[PDB]
Structures are given as C-alpha cells and as structure tokens.
Design a protein around this ligand. Structure first.
Ligand SMILES: NC(=O)c1ccc[n+]([C@@H]2O[C@H](COP(=O)([O-])OP(=O)(O)OC[C@H]3O[C@@H](n4cnc5c(N)ncnc54)[C@H](O)[C@@H]3O)[C@@H](O)[C@H]2O)c1
Ligand SMILES: NC(=O)c1ccc[n+]([C@@H]2O[C@H](COP(=O)([O-])OP(=O)(O)OC[C@H]3O[C@@H](n4cnc5c(N)ncnc54)[C@H](O)[C@@H]3O)[C@@H](O)[C@H]2O)c1
Ligand SMILES: NC(=O)c1ccc[n+]([C@@H]2O[C@H](COP(=O)([O-])OP(=O)(O)OC[C@H]3O[C@@H](n4cnc5c(N)ncnc54)[C@H](O)[C@@H]3O)[C@@H](O)[C@H]2O)c1
Ligand SMILES: NC(=O)c1ccc[n+]([C@@H]2O[C@H](COP(=O)([O-])OP(=O)(O)OC[C@H]3O[C@@H](n4cnc5c(N)ncnc54)[C@H](O)[C@@H]3O)[C@@H](O)[C@H]2O)c1
Lengths: 338, 337, 338, 337
C-alpha cells in the first residue's frame, strides 16, 4: 500500500528527487504534488531539461494551469511561499519532502503537518537538536514511525558517515579533520554580490571559496562514538556537481593503506552495498556524476603516515547520490507506515 | 561641485565608484551610497572584486553608517524604498540608479520626491518619454531641463558609436546583430527559477540565447535608424567583456579597408575615448578595464557582395559602460542650472 | 558483407566515431584496428571514461599489449606516428578513418593506401581541391566507389550546408556571412602558450577567441550554387562541446520568419530527416549535447529584416553530431563497395 | 651587474620577466630569452596575458632577433638544443631554466657547456646531488660554489615557510597535506593523451587528483622533516592561485590563536615578504599577483584534540613563485664570485 508524497521546493534537490524516484523499479511512494513558485511552466521545463542531469527521457507535459504529466502520471502543481496555505488535508498528503531549505526547523516544518500532512522529511540538517537525523547505511534502523519530522542530513555528512563508521569499528578514531572540495551551489553568487557570508558572495565559477560545514560535527548525530572527534571546512570550486571529502583521522590501532582499503571493501561488498563503493580506476570528478552510492573511496589515494595518521579521499555526487538517499529514507517511512 | 548619490551598490554601482574615483578631474562628489548590506558589505565588495581586482585605494569602515576611500567618507543609507532616502537632508543634486528596479518616471521619480533634483538610470528607460543618451553619439542633445535620463544599455553604448559612422559614411538600409555576451547577475548559477527559461539555465555551463532591445534602442540615439536594426544575445561563460557582431546592408558600395578607415577617422578625432580601432589580434580578456565604449577588431571587418558589412566590436560591459555613466553624470555637472 | 575499418588518431573524433558506430543497430562496418600513440592503456581508459560523452556503458578491457576488447569484440591497437609502417596490407584493411588531422592531404593520406589500405575517409577538410568533399543530406549521392580518398568536411560545414541548401532552393541566396560561436578544441591552449595563431594561443576556458573558418567557402564544395556567396569567422567560447551557427543571408524572394521555419520543417520531416531538426523549445547549448542530427534550427530565433535579410541560428554538437555523419559517410562507402 | 638568460618563455619565464622588470633595485640584467616562437610570439605573449593582464610596459619588436621593454632590448635565440646557445658570446653569468625539460645535472649542464657560469632551475631537481633552496627557509645555505641550483616547486615554496614556524614553535611528529591547485600546462584542455590518466582529463571541467613531491621535498630545505610529511594535489578549474591544506600532529599541545600568533611573529619579522597572515575572509582571486610565498587564512586555522593542527595557506603558484625565482637569482648576484 503506497504512500502519497508532496515535494516542497522544486529546486536542484526537489527535481533530482523526482527523477531519482521515477527511475526506481519498485517503490512505495506516489508523488502527487509539488509546491513550485514558478507554476506549471517552470516545473515542466526545468524537470525535462537539466544542465547537469541532462534531458529526462520520460514524457513531461503541462495538462492545465494546475497540473503537469510525467510519462502519463498526473502531478498537481501548487504555489504558496507560505506553507500553511498548502492543500495537504484535501489531497490526503501522508509525507512531505522539504527541499526548500527554508522550512527546516520544527516550527516551519510543522506547518506542512498543520496544513494536514502526516510526516515531513527535511532534505537538509534540521536547525534544532529535537529533530532526529538519519543516514542510510549507518543509522536508518533507528528511525521510528512515531517520528513526525525527520532529517536526512547534509550531502557531505552522507558521504562522511558511512566510511567514518568503518574506520571507527575497524581502527577506532581519536580525532580528525576533513575538507570537502565541493561543487558550487545556488547559495553562492554567480558574480560578486550581496550575501550574509562575504566568501559565498564571490563569483562561484571564478574562485576557490572557503566556507564553514557542520558535516564533521553532524556525523556525531548518527554515530554517537564520534561526538566531538571531528571538525572541518569546505572549499567550493568551479564545478557544477560532484564533490570530494578529504579526511585525516588519528586512529588507535596502527595500520597501513591496503588494510584500510580492505576494511572499506568488506563494507562495500557486505552491509554497505549500494551506499559505499571502493573505486580502483584513476578517475576524476565528472566520472562520479549521477552515481547512486553516497560515497566512492578513491583506493589509490588512501594514505597512512607514521602508523596512525590515516587520510581517505571519498567522491560523492552531492545532488544525485544524496537524492538517491532521500528516496531511500522516504521508502523506510513508507515501509514502516502505520 | 554637484553632490552625487548611488542607489544600488552592485556591479554597475561598484564599477561607478572605482571609475569616478580614478578621474584626475571630476565635477562629481559622491557623498552617499544606498546598500542593504551596510558598511561591512559595501567596504568589503568595493575593496575585493573577482573581475576588477583589489582596489588600490585605502578603504575602511569609519562607523556604523560611513566608509572612507583614501580618507574621503561616504554615508551608507539602507532602504529598499527610495521615498525614505534623506537626499533633501544630504542636499543630493544627482542620483545614479544602479538598482535596475526603478526604471520608469514613477520608480525613478521617488528619488526626487526624497530631495534629489535629477536621476541618471544605468539602464534603458521602461518609459518612452524618458530621453536616453549615449556619450559620443547624442549627449549634445542633453539638457538640464530633463529631470530623469537614461544612459542606455552596455550593448547599445558599444553599437551606437560605430553604427553612427556607418550611417554617416555609407548609410544603413537594414541590419541584424548578435552580441556574444559575458554572463550577468540576471542569470542563475545552476538551473533555477527565471521568467526567461533560457536565463534559468546554469550560466557558466552554457551558450544561452536571450532577447536584446539593444538593436531597436539605437533608434533612440540615432532617429535615422528606426526599424532598420534587430538582434539577439548569446550569453556565454565569461564574467566580463562582450563582443557585438553586426551585419548591415549599406547604400554606398564599399570594402573592408574603406570601412575600417571610416572608424579610424572617428577614433582619432570626434569619438576619441568612445570608439577605438584595434589592429593587434586580441581576445576578450585583453579588453578588460578598457575605458572606450567600442573596440573595432580591424582584421575581422568583412564586406560581402559590395554592400553587406560585418563589423566585430569588443566592449567591457562593466567597466566601459561605467566610464560612460561617469561621462553622462559629468555632462549634467557642466550643464547644471 | 561488412568492410574492415582502421581508425587513425584515437582523439576526440576517433573515440566519438567508435562509440557512434558501436551504438548503431545495423552497420556494414567492422572496426578491427586503431593507430594510437598511447598504446592499449590510453586507448582503453579514454574510451571507457569521457568528460563530455560520459562513461561508455559497453565493456572495455585490455586483452594484451596489442589488443583491447569492447563488449567482447577484439580490436588491434598499433602505434606508428609515421603511417607508412601501419599494417594495412597484413590486416586486409579496406577503409581507414583519418582522424589525426595531420594526414589530410593526398600525399599523407595515400600512405594508408600505400601501406595496403583500400580507401581513406578524412575526418576534416582536405588541404587540396583534388580530394572530393561530401556532406550527408546534401551531396552524399555524388560519392563514387572509384574515389580512393574522401573528405566529410568540417563540423561547421556539416551544420551550415543542410540548412543553406533549403534556403537556396526555397528563397535563393545572393550573399551572406556566418559566425560559429564554437566550443573550444584541443587546438586551443589551456593557459597562454605557443601557437602559430596568437589568438588560439590564449587560455581557452578564460576567453572568447576569434578564429578564421573555411566553412563559409567550403559549403560551395557540396552546393556549387553557393560559390563565392558566403564568408565568416568563428568565436571559440569556454564550453567543452556544442556549437551554434549564426547565419545572415540576403535572399532573392522576400519572406518572413514563419515561412523560413516552414521550409526547414518541410526538409526536417522529409528528405533531411535525421540530419536537419527544427527545435521549438527554448533550449541552451547543453541540451544539444549528444544529438544525432548535423543541425538543429532554433525556430524562435529565426529573424527577417526588411523582407530579404534572413538570420538563422542552428545548434550542432561538433563532436557527436559530426561523428554520426562520419559513421554515415563510411556506411555509404560500405554500401557502394565493389 | 650579473647577466641573466631565460630559457623557455612559458608561464614561469614570462612571469619572471614581469616580476624582475618590476623591481625598483635589481642586480640582474636580463639580456637574452630562448623562445621557439621568435620576437613576434615573445613580444605578443609578454604584452597580452590572460591571467596577469596587459603589461603596463612599452613592448616592441626592434628587429628579427630583438624586442625592447621600455626601450631595453633583449635578444631572442631560438634553439630546442641548449648546447647551441651563444652564452659564451653573450657573456651569460646565470641562466633561468623555465623549460621544465632540463632538470638534471646533465640537462641543466648543457647551458654551462655553452658558456653560462650557473643554472637556476624553476622546478624540483631530478638529481639528488642538486641543492634546492626556498627563500625565507634555507637560502642562507646558498653558496656561489653550486653551479646548478633548484628553486623547488610552487607548492613547496608555500608549505616550507609555515612548516618551518610549526617545527620551531611546536615541532612536527608527522603530517599530511592536500593542495587544491589551479590547472597548469601539463593538463589537457579536452580528454587526450597523457602519461597520467588523471591529467589526461579536461582541466576546466574536473577536480583532478594528482601526485605531489611537495610534501617530501620540504625535507630538502628542512632536514628535520625527513619522512614526516606526505600529500596529494587536487587540480581544480581555476587558471591561477592555489591553497595548501596541512594537517600535522605536533609535540607541543596548542590552540588556534597560539598557532596564528607564531605565524604572525614570522610574518612581521624574519619572513616579511615570504609569509603573510591574512585576517580578511578572502577568496583565491584576491591572492592573484601577491608577492608573498604563503598567505595563512587565519580564521581557518583549526586545532583538534590539542596536537592535530590544520593550516590553510593561499599562494599564487605563478606570480609568488616567480617573485621567489627573482629572489634566488638576486641571492646568486650578491654572492657572485
Ligand atoms: N544541491 C546540493 O548539492 C545539496 C545537497 C544536499 C543538501 N542540500 C540542501 O537542499 C536544500 C535545497 O537545495 P537546492 O540546491 O535544491 O536549492 P535550489 O535553490 O535549487 O532549490 C530551492 C527551491 O525552493 C524554492 N522555494 C524557496 N522558498 C520557497 C517557499 N517558501 N515555498 C516553496 N518553494 C520555495 C526556490 O524558488 C527554489 O525553486 C537546501 O537545504 C540545501 O542545503 C543541497
Ligand atoms: N552588468 C552589466 O554588464 C551592465 C552594464 C550595463 C548596464 N547594466 C544595468 O545595470 C543595472 C545594474 O546591474 P548589475 O549587473 O550591477 O546588477 P547587480 O545585481 O550586481 O546590482 C544590483 C544591486 O542593487 C541592489 N538593489 C536591488 N533592489 C534594491 C532596492 N529596492 N533598493 C536598493 N538597492 C537595491 C542589489 O542588492 C544589488 O546590490 C541593471 O539595470 C542592468 O541592466 C548592466
Ligand atoms: N573535435 C571537433 O569538434 C572536431 C569537429 C570536426 C572536425 N574535427 C577534426 O578532426 C581532427 C581531429 O580532431 P580532434 O578534436 O579529435 O583532435 P584530438 O587532438 O582529440 O585527436 C588527435 C589524436 O591524433 C593523435 N595523433 C597525432 N599525430 C598522430 C600520428 N602521426 N599518428 C597517429 N595518431 C596521431 C593525437 O595524439 C591524438 O590522440 C582534426 O582534423 C579536426 O579539425 C574536429
Ligand atoms: N606554472 C606554475 O604554476 C609553476 C610554478 C612553479 C613551478 N613551475 C615549473 O615551471 C616550469 C615551467 O612551467 P610553465 O607552467 O611555465 O610551463 P609552460 O609550458 O607554460 O612553459 C614551458 C615553455 O618552455 C618552452 N620549451 C619547451 N621545450 C623547450 C626546449 N627544448 N627549448 C626551449 N624552450 C622549450 C615551451 O615552448 C614553453 O614556452 C616547470 O618546470 C614547472 O614544473 C610551475
């Protein structure tokens, strides 16, 4: 028995979620609605043509001023900047995908429940500790149907947590730091312009732009043994999608690169299959575009210095790979629904 | 002499301050800047520029509402509503409208309600009755009696001066143009919401066709050209400098060397500093921070079938346009009261 | 009865030719060899992973120091900078695809015949008038098996000639000029460096770089009525693939945009089906990536000024669309072979 | 005073001429340039630069084998073989090896066979016995008796000075580094032939992991660091400026403010002009055309678990490295004979 879904914010994340879900062979989700500010004309066009994903093979059409069609499946399009006006009760909306990035606290996110929706799934870190956070392949087992509002974490935390988990079990972690060399996002300005963060203000395709990240501390939400053990930053570089995590950890049990790669390979062929991948080919960022996995370990880059300083480089598609996790977590809510 | 206010401290407002600050002789005294970001944003973005490079000038935050450039202070007002702005109080003669939001008599009009005597719009006027000027083409028809004026678009400022030579020397039957244009702030960094589904597309990944009023707009500064020119823009992945590609059927049969000589006459005399003729085989980045409106690529000038003229002209859409903005505002200074 | 093919120069064109051909449902070609300077390791890697085409779905493997495998089909890899040493006689090589761009005159190209090859197919304009030039959908009918050496023209001439043909038949052309706003190529330098052309010397991804083009005069080789009627230039901009032709022609019969688009639509639905396309969606360069057609008319951009000045904007994928023509022309030689 | 020859007029050779030409006081006199492109290529690429911008200097072609910069002539020899070069005839004291092709005693040695007394390699030495120097770290150990010397790599020049402070003040146990590096000439514009299958990939489209000797190379100028440091490079789509990300376990437990103060001590005194400490929140392009080797991003300095130090340092891999090349060559001038 499938569950009825609404997508709030038809952005990079909302559209990637639709194409991720649409391409699944078997699903318990049925997307019926999309709150989109630009109406049917925007939602239908940007859904069909995409500068990073490419052209959607499915058939996209505008049925009328309130609806679009994907391969004949009708979808209601609504438009309210204020979520309280959204028709969640009338359309019997079980689950919302909150991809706007504005309604990420419990007050704002609750409005979708208030407008009659049964559950909310934040496509980002929540802004309060009261909202439970999950990473598929790490702690999705701990999700309970009683949780009305859930967080699927950051794209970077989705890359970091699965391989951090393996390191923690196999070698044990004392402390560490990370750098995400991350593709530019819609938050950065195209040319130098207004922004509360004076780095993110600078022309994105011209510059290496340092920015703060919560992925290093956020890992502790899904892996309690990591509490206070990691910090880090990000460097936004002029690529439109695909990112890489550079992790330096001090480990308890002295090791070597081949032993650290064997641990990742055990996890990849076993319990983290589909989430963690170990790549042995000497590839580049574009080769990781549209990968389904959360993290791809660059095997040849793994480096151990002085027996216990371990460096791991992990590729992730921050749009698509994260979207394939958002479809996974939503499926867990569908599988658990009362 | 005249006391200038800058509304909207974006690429054109910040280009205007650096251009004006670089004039040896200036009749303009920039006293106020309206920026939402406050002294801390304005000081930072004036000083660090991804395109322009670091301002050589000493820029500091004096207090909560003032910055100094080489010790000269400027007030930072912060209202999205022009009607609020204290220009009666600050005795503001002229206002530079770099917001792109107040483009009509009513929108532009609000600055004058607030005390300013005149408005200079760094963009085409939305309203017909607003006179538009291109320095080196029709700035002579400028009059103090005009309270709200337009400095046209960056593309129109590149096109109008060379079109002017062509119409004088050969005469124009009709013509079409393409501007291969550097991306701008209108465009989205990644595919996102936009009225223009083309401008919605990732700016740094694409050649993005878009509309241009620049061809028809030439008829505003050269009335002889009404209904003769049309064109499009191809926005491409460069942060500044753009190039106009014009194809015109002309009345007087001609050849490449003869067209270039006509441009060179104008370059050396009446349009010096507005029109340049470039002989070296350069690329867009070499036209960065050029003060001229138009740089004819002399070797690209082509004539086919005697009367079909193709001209390729470079322009820094930020810096060259901004130098013309400084020039139009200076003209209102020399014609003031 | 299929013909045996060798690819000389496993560059952007050689590799695009292999993937174009490999993806054809029915073909009379059987690629058996590739002269590649970088040996099996280069040819196998760059064939599998591609920054513009993306990852090849087929199975690519190195069988030994002289061979690679594509989906189990074995291919001999050789390496001679000097074509005279190539094993064309011993491998019974009927047809060579000359994609090096160095052996494009009749003396250099003949060396592949001299080394025992039966025919040569230059992936570029030939440097002498003695080598016949063909454009599929315009003049491929005039190709004769007796022609040992053939030219498939430039990517730009492949975009220009099909739509120029329609204009010439329907309205008749007096004179015109073109601009190709073209993606950067391997000929341009990444950073400012040595080049005989001081424009092409300048950093390609930083600049709009003017360059000479023979596509405007080259059109007269396939459409003799165009002789001396067109000239033009190119502007190389910082995109890695996909280009656009901006054509301004003076026509005899006075017309309007909708009439000019109707002519292109008649050709597209009729005799130029698969080569000429009319696009009504407001798209951008990336949307034309990996298109099979030689030319896609941007319908909404078509413009007529003063009754007889006509402007047409035509998108073309200079790598893939051109490669789908190179596979087409090679098929015509296979279909005509004695 | 000393008569300098530049072999290989690429990004480093052209950066060297502009850097040297900008020194108020110089003991160097650049008399000859070996460029395959001839006076017409050298004059053009010295004058027009996609990164550096237009040379303010007057550059002209005097004749078939000479260019003038601000009237000073330079001879343009054109031989791929250094053994051919007429440096006995031109009385060439020092040769700047910017080709990247003659990196060993034998390859570098050919310039001296041809008449030159000394060779300065703008890259790591292929041969062990060739001494390498980093200005602000170990240039004091420089001696005239060394006929062939190395100025190390751009990354090593960024790393070595701040590593030096860390080893003095806190001491280094072991450490790893990543340099997020601007693309270079080694890399291909579109996927094409390369020994390094990663460097084969389109430079402006990708984050491209590559090897670096920069971590181990620090042990050449700081012998205390042997076997303590390793690293990689991520080449990214920017034309210049790069940033070193170093994580080191140190002996003396410490905190962010204490590490930054140690860098600031070095910046204000012994490493002034080699090491800078930046407090403003800048981006890579703001570090363009900086003369310093290293720019510490003060706010990014992080200390985790008391003894794991992360430092983020900017460097213009072209211009800052080139200013160090000018500095090493100057040192051979002040120690000459
Ligand atoms: N893109 C990534 O790499 C990535 C990765 C993981 C997490 N995220 C998170 O996903 C969220 C969205 O990111 P994105 O890249 O898709 O951004 P985006 O800008 O592409 O998407 C945001 C969309 O929401 C719309 N919107 C804004 N306010 C709205 C409102 N009140 N009601 C309805 N729609 C509204 C916008 O107009 C836009 O269409 C953010 O929280 C971001 O941090 C992004
Ligand atoms: N950039 C060019 O190449 C160029 C050159 C010629 C003309 N123009 C014209 O210049 C104008 C400015 O363009 P730009 O590229 O600098 O844009 P921009 O977005 O960089 O600058 C706009 C600035 O105005 C501010 N602003 C917006 N609404 C405001 C309000 N209500 N009150 C106060 N400030 C407000 C914004 O915060 C921003 O700082 C436009 O009209 C544009 O058409 C552009
Ligand atoms: N890429 C395009 O957009 C495009 C379009 C149509 C026409 N063309 C033409 O196709 C040809 C190749 O272009 P490309 O973009 O594929 O270039 P490329 O540089 O990607 O391909 C050239 C390849 O040939 C190899 N090669 C060079 N000399 C050789 C020799 N003596 N023997 C064997 N191999 C040799 C090179 O090492 C390289 O692998 C040129 O004539 C070009 O004008 C290019
Ligand atoms: N570019 C940087 O960021 C940087 C900074 C530090 C060190 N380096 C080192 O500087 C050196 C030069 O690098 P680059 O980026 O300027 O490379 P480049 O390719 O721009 O410069 C090389 C120049 O040498 C010329 N050359 C090649 N072989 C020659 C020969 N046999 N005889 C004469 N001239 C010859 C080439 O034609 C070219 O003009 C390399 O060793 C590099 O490792 C690079």
């Amino acid at each position: 028995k499938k569950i009825r879904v609404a997508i709030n914010g038809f952005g990079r994340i909302g559209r990637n979620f639709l194409r991720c879900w649409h391409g699944r062979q078997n699903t318990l989700l049925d997307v019926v609605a999309i709150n989109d500010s630009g109406g049917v004309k925007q939602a239908s066009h940007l859904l069909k043509y995409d500068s990073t994903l490419g052209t959607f093979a499915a058939d996209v059409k505008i049925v009328d001023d309130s609806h679009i069609s994907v391969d004949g499946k009708q979808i209601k399009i609504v438009s309210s900047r204020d979520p309280l006006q959204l028709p969640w009760k009338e359309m019997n909306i079980d689950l919302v995908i909150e991809g706007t990035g504005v309604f990420i606290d419990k007050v704002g996110a609750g409005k979708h429940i208030q407008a009659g929706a049964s559950k909310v799934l934040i496509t980002a870190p929540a802004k309060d500790k009261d909202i439970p956070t999950f990473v598929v392949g790490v702690n999705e087992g701990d999700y309970k149907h009683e949780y009305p509002i859930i967080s699927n974490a950051s794209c970077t935390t989705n890359c970091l947590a699965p391989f951090v988990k393996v390191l923690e079990q196999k070698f044990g972690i004392v402390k560490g730091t990370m750098t995400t060399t991350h593709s530019y996002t819609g938050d950065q300005r195209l040319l130098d312009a207004s922004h509360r963060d004076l780095r993110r203000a600078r022309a994105a395709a011209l510059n290496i732009v340092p920015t703060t990240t919560g992925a290093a501390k956020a890992v502790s939400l899904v892996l309690p043994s990591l509490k206070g053990k990691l910090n880090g930053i990000a460097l936004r570089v002029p690529t439109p999608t695909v990112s890489v995590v550079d992790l330096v950890v001090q480990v308890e049990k002295k090791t070597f690169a081949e032993e650290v790669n064997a641990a990742f390979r055990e996890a990849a062929n076993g319990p983290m299959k589909g989430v963690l991948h170990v790549e042995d080919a000497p590839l580049v960022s574009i080769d990781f575009k549209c990968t389904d996995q959360s993290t791809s370990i660059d095997a040849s880059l793994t480096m151990v210095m002085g027996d216990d300083m371990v460096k791991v480089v992990a590729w992730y598609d921050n749009e698509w790979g994260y979207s394939q996790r958002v479809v996974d977590l939503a499926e867990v809510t569908a599988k658990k629904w009362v």
